[PDB]
Design a protein around this ligand. Sequence first.
Ligand SMILES: Cc1cc2nc3c(=O)[nH]c(=O)nc-3n(C[C@H](O)[C@H](O)[C@H](O)COP(=O)(O)OP(=O)(O)OC[C@H]3O[C@@H](n4cnc5c(N)ncnc54)[C@H](O)[C@@H]3O)c2cc1C
Ligand SMILES: Cc1ncc(C[n+]2c([C@@](C)(O)OO)sc(CCOP(=O)(O)OP(=O)(O)O)c2C)c(N)n1
Ligand SMILES: COc1cc(C)nc(NC(=O)NS(=O)(=O)c2ccccc2OCCCl)n1
Ligand SMILES: [Mg+2]
Length: 582
Amino acid sequence: TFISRFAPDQPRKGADILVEALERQGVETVFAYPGGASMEIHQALTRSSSIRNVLPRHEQGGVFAAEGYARSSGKPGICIATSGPGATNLVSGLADALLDSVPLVAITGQVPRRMIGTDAFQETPIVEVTRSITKHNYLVMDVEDIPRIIEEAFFLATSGRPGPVLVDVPKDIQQQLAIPNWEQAMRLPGYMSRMPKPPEDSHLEQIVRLISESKKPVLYVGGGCLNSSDELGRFVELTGIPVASTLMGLGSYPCDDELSLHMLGMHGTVYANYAVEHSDLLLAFGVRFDDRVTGKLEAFASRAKIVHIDIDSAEIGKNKTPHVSVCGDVKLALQGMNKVLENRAEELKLDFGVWRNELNVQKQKFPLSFKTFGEAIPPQYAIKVLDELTDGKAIISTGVGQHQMWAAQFYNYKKPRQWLSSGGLGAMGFGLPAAIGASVANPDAIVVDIDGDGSFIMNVQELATIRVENLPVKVLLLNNQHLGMVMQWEDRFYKANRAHTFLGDPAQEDEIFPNMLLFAAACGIPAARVTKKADLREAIQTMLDTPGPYLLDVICPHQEHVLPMIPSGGTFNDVITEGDGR
Ligand SMILES: Cc1cc2nc3c(=O)[nH]c(=O)nc-3n(C[C@H](O)[C@H](O)[C@H](O)COP(=O)(O)OP(=O)(O)OC[C@H]3O[C@@H](n4cnc5c(N)ncnc54)[C@H](O)[C@@H]3O)c2cc1C
Ligand SMILES: Cc1ncc(C[n+]2c([C@@](C)(O)OO)sc(CCOP(=O)(O)OP(=O)(O)O)c2C)c(N)n1
Ligand SMILES: COc1cc(C)nc(NC(=O)NS(=O)(=O)c2ccccc2OCCCl)n1
Ligand SMILES: [Mg+2]
């Protein structure tokens, strides 16, 4: 039974109704940056004794923090911004949450209703701007609609395929007195009638039937399985099918497990891409067949019977036409299939040891490899050390680029929601703010931001947020003085012709620029730099043992290349396995 701070017959400001609507949704943390159009909301937040606000230093940091909060907990992330420039700064985060299907509720202030359309002070049609980069949005036109719209916003953001929902609130609605009706019914008749039903038994029996008839099955696991780690692990026990995971699905099935094929796709392991290439049964659970995974669609699983389970019917058959399809929650599909596999276990006699041995040969002939040049620190090795010293229990957020791939390749994530990374949009500057949101959602957890020097500086202002909020955020900064991923493509396809990919100072060309240690020093964050591989282990240990925030500047040779690499739109026979920028 919820307890209000107001009487059931007492009028209150619309902003106070909005905050209570968040309290009734179980919201404990918001990321709000104040402004003229949202000042009433911020006043109402201070009257709440249960909602904590983490003030960022940039609204993009606010929405990215809301993402990390959501990605690391399953709860919806809530960020608030003012109208105009505050709202437009949320754009990259909204598009990022939509492409990666992250539950998020963004609240933006707006000019009063009578001013909409007049090009008023700090007015942008944020609903028109964000309509194509949000799951849904609203423009509240009456204070009495606040309880209903907030309930619909959280329902849409978290149900079905999760996504971002934006609620635009005019300032006059925030100031108007009203008595909220919390028993309003939601006006989502179409969306609720099309919600996927629990999977039929006839569909699940035919999938188990296809498993016993297959000799080379491969699990194709993605972000849709982040809530099915137990059901998926039970499914792999009953079948013994090797598991190939996407960038978004890392952690659903443990990386250090005997049956793990690790990541597949453009930068996936050779054996994972080999397994999908020569498979006859592809179990696509919670994936969307991204071009970064498939390459040339006609050659992707060209001789496999494809079973696609997805909660979004618009995804089934979008890029790759499956033989069998199940539109529903993969968590329930795994539960129903696990029941069938237990009863008919001895009847089925499932054994893929010949297929597993064929893959284990590829796993030992073509494993993930990296060179060690003198005393220079290999970035892959630094992430390996961080894995050991944290026992693989840390929450990892990354930016975008070479460091992002190495953090996916060389860290053994044991559970889902340890891996917070922008995969669909691939937005730089995601790492640091996402670590902020993950730390607030998991206060007793090890949170490390494996960032690149280009991505880290984009939202470097959030170092102030880390210090003020006293968050134990660790920053493992893999510094190669370059936009490394674009540099790698320059080496491969443009004769190593540098086109504005160097991030240092050409005048002092051999100096580490910028001095990231002084960025942390400006925000009272202890920091250190390591250059030689011998000192790396003690440096990372110092970062972990030092209470509170810490920044570790890890200098890496820039000529490293992420390997292996299937060129964009290529096939498995086009995979690149050797070479760098030397
Ligand atoms: C530089 C860079 C390189 C990259 N290279 C690679 C790469 O080599 N390999 C790679 O895998 N990725 C790579 N990506 C990431 C990438 O572009 C995509 O994000 C990823 O490939 C697609 O993830 P996904 O297939 O799991 O679908 P997601 O984006 O995770 O979406 C989840 C899917 O499952 C469905 N779903 C959601 N919930 C449920 C549920 N409860 N039940 C059933 N279904 C559900 C959704 O409808 C959706 O179709 C790279 C990204 C970057 C930035
Ligand atoms: C807001 C934004 N702007 C430009 C981007 C285009 N990209 C990249 C990519 C892969 O998305 O291109 O497809 S990666 C990248 C450079 C990465 O700099 P780093 O942080 O130092 O990482 P590293 O360890 O050195 O490689 C750029 C410029 C991007 N994604 N986001
Ligand atoms: C790690 O991914 C990266 C990283 C970097 C730095 N640069 C590229 N370069 C291309 O991606 N070139 S592209 O094939 O024309 C292309 C561009 C944009 C979207 C899709 C696409 O593929 C379409 C063919 Cl299916 N890829
Ligand atoms: Mg870099």
